[PDB]
Every structure is written in structure tokens, then in C-alpha cells.
Design a protein around this ligand. Sequence first.
Ligand SMILES: Cc1cc2nc3c(=O)[nH]c(=O)nc-3n(C[C@H](O)[C@H](O)[C@H](O)COP(=O)(O)OP(=O)(O)OC[C@H]3O[C@@H](n4cnc5c(N)ncnc54)[C@H](O)[C@@H]3O)c2cc1C
Ligand SMILES: NC(=O)c1ccc[n+]([C@@H]2O[C@H](COP(=O)([O-])OP(=O)(O)OC[C@H]3O[C@@H](n4cnc5c(N)ncnc54)[C@H](OP(=O)(O)O)[C@@H]3O)[C@@H](O)[C@H]2O)c1
Length: 257
Amino acid sequence: SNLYTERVLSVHHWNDTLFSFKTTRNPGLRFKTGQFVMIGLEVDGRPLMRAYSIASPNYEEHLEFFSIKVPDGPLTSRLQHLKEGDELMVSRKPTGTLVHDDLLPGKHLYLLSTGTGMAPFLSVIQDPETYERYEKVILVHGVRWVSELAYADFITKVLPEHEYFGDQVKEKLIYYPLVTREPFRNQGRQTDLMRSGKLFEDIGLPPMNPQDDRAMICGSPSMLEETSAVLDSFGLKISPRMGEPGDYLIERAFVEK
Ligand SMILES: Cc1cc2nc3c(=O)[nH]c(=O)nc-3n(C[C@H](O)[C@H](O)[C@H](O)COP(=O)(O)OP(=O)(O)OC[C@H]3O[C@@H](n4cnc5c(N)ncnc54)[C@H](O)[C@@H]3O)c2cc1C
Ligand SMILES: NC(=O)c1ccc[n+]([C@@H]2O[C@H](COP(=O)([O-])OP(=O)(O)OC[C@H]3O[C@@H](n4cnc5c(N)ncnc54)[C@H](OP(=O)(O)O)[C@@H]3O)[C@@H](O)[C@H]2O)c1
């Protein structure tokens, strides 16, 4: 099989349905920030592979994945049990549309996500190129429960202290977690908050316009479609195809199987 077999380095469970893990990374595995790759486990004679956004920075020699834990999900029912040292199959060629090159120059980069959709954005917010290209980077992470706001500490406390671009992070990264079913400082769906302009008021930024604002949307199919429409409502135009820069990019965080 032409798959990499990486080794789990660490695992961290965020809550009952979310966990992340880091694995070794084959030097041959190159990827652009935002991309996903197939990862999985050998099950009953065949790799059980699923598309996974690489949540780690593309210049670090390890991979990190932010994962859902579906009770009876073929892969995650097993993946949730990953432990240090475990093998993880990883495909050789990443892919995906959430890449910097396909966003026209702009001033603000909105990373609109829900659930595990924040995964590729974890890579984005750790990518120096993100800060080279934007004045502001807004990571919106919409979840149902506060416990699902995975990486909170990393985003708000660790990343800003990053030895090399923590200053860029402090100056440019706005983290806007959103919770919809539990008391939280920022309540609601980002679609609604953007339509009302509340999201931008909350983060101290002007409403979006096609000239200044770019976005990457990664979330549930439903959110993806509606958020895309919201951005369209502001006059932004999605990149029509890879290699063809646009105002925003989208990728489903998952698909209903
Ligand atoms: C481009 C792309 C990138 C992806 N990146 C990630 C990632 O970084 N992390 C991750 O956990 N998953 C990601 N997914 C989903 C992932 O590929 C699998 O669906 C996941 O790993 C669950 O596999 P499964 O075999 O356990 O359950 P599956 O049979 O895949 O899915 C079972 C059911 O789980 C729900 N489901 C699956 N994945 C999710 C999810 N992430 N969040 C909420 N509900 C979900 C749906 O209701 C689905 O029908 C991605 C999917 C695509 C298409
Ligand atoms: N197929 C879909 O499009 C879809 C979408 C959402 C959930 N689900 C189901 O519920 C499970 C958990 O899905 P999830 O991972 O994304 O967790 P989720 O909790 O269901 O969604 C996380 C966040 O996304 C928000 N959201 C949902 N729909 C939205 C929309 N159209 N626009 C903007 N924000 C939206 C939710 O608000 P609310 O609390 O108001 O829902 C919540 O804050 C999935 O495994 C799936 O079975 C499916």
C-alpha cells in the first residue's frame, strides 16, 4: 500500500465527541496550509480511511488532527481509542481548496468554522503566511456546547506567545468562539451574527466587503451553504475553482453519510 504509517505522539480528548492527536510526519508528506489528507486504520484487512484536515502547521515535522468521535462512526469509533505509539495510516497527497493561494489579496481573513471545521484553521492560524497576508485574521468557531471549544487555551494563551510570530498573533488574530446552546460570552450562529453585523461589531471590525475581506469557511454542510450565502450577500465571490483566486473558499467539515 502506498500509504504512510505514522505513529501517534500524543492524544488529547477535549470532551465526549472531540479529541486531537499528533503523529509523526513523513518528510515526503508536503501540504499547503488548509489541506486535508486521508488518515485511518487497518480494519478487517483494509485501511478504513477518512478525509482529515491537517491541523498542524505545515512547517512542523509532525501532524496533528482535530477529530470528532462518532459513537458508531466506522473510523472514529476506533480512532477515539488512539494512544501514543499507535499506528495511523496517512495518505501521501494532501488536497483541498482551503489554501492561501486561492484567496485574492485582502485585509482580513475570516476563518468561519463550526465543530471540527476549525481543524484546517488551526493550521492557518499557525501559518506565518497567514499573518504576512492579512491585517486581521478572525477565527470564528461555532459550537453547540462550551466544552466543544477545543484549543481555547492554545488559541488564546499559547499561540500569542509563539516565539516567532506570537506578536503577529497578538496583533492580528481575533478568536471569536461561538456557543449556541449554553451560556457563553458569544452566543449564536455566525451566519445570524454576520447578517446582523453583530459579529463584526463584537470583534471591532467593519462589516465585510468584497475588497477587504476574505474567508475560508469550514463547517457542517448546512453551515457551509448558509455562511457562503451570507458572504455572497456582502458581495464576496467564492473562488470558482482551485488555482482561481476568489474572495472566499469553502470545504465541508464533514458530510452526512
Ligand atoms: C474535506 C473533509 C475534511 C474533513 N476533516 C475532518 C477533520 O479534520 N476532523 C474530523 O473529525 N472529521 C473530518 N472530516 C470527517 C471525516 O472524514 C469522517 O467523517 C470522520 O472522521 C468520522 O468517520 P467515521 O468513519 O467515524 O464516521 P462516518 O461514517 O464518516 O460519519 C458518520 C456520521 O458522523 C457525522 N460526522 C462525521 N464527521 C463529523 C465531524 N467531523 N463533525 C460532526 N459530525 C461528523 C455525520 O452525521 C455522519 O454521517 C472531514 C471530511 C471531509 C469531506
Ligand atoms: N448535515 C448538516 O449540515 C449538519 C449541521 C449541523 C449538525 N448536524 C448533525 O449534528 C452533529 C454535530 O454536527 P456539528 O458538528 O456541526 O455540531 P453542531 O452542534 O450541530 O453545530 C455546531 C455549531 O454549528 C451551528 N450551526 C448549525 N447549523 C448552522 C448553520 N446553518 N449556520 C451557521 N451555524 C450553524 C450550531 O448552531 P445550533 O446549535 O443552533 O444548531 C452549533 O453552534 C453532526 O454529526 C450531524 O449528525 C448536521
